Amino acid sequence: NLYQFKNMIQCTVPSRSWADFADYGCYCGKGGSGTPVDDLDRCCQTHDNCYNEAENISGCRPYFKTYSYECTQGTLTCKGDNNACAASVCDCDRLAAICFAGAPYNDANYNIDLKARCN
């Protein structure tokens, strides 16, 4: 779920408030359209698409589905006890958190005008 995804970001990016990623570019947060503005936005575009795919699984709701994962000693791992829905969503979240940690954060791209800039 989103609480778990937030804790994944706190584990891989402990310099910064998860809220920094909640409204960035065209894809991070609410947005899901237009041309990704940078590398970080591209992480979010892949994450958004990943969730759309997981939604094809019967009864699978990536926003709410609780999966099993661990984050210790610099390592994020989705555990073996996950069903097909949990496993897919966990992996979407894990790959995004890792992506976030490697991409540069441009303060100019936070809270941009989606209606104007994400067509």
């Binding site: 995804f5 937030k6 809220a19 909640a22 894809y27 609410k30 947005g31 899901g32 995004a96």
Partner: peptide
Amino acid sequence: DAEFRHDS
């Protein structure tokens, strides 16, 4: 904390 929608 929040219930802001997402961190996509």
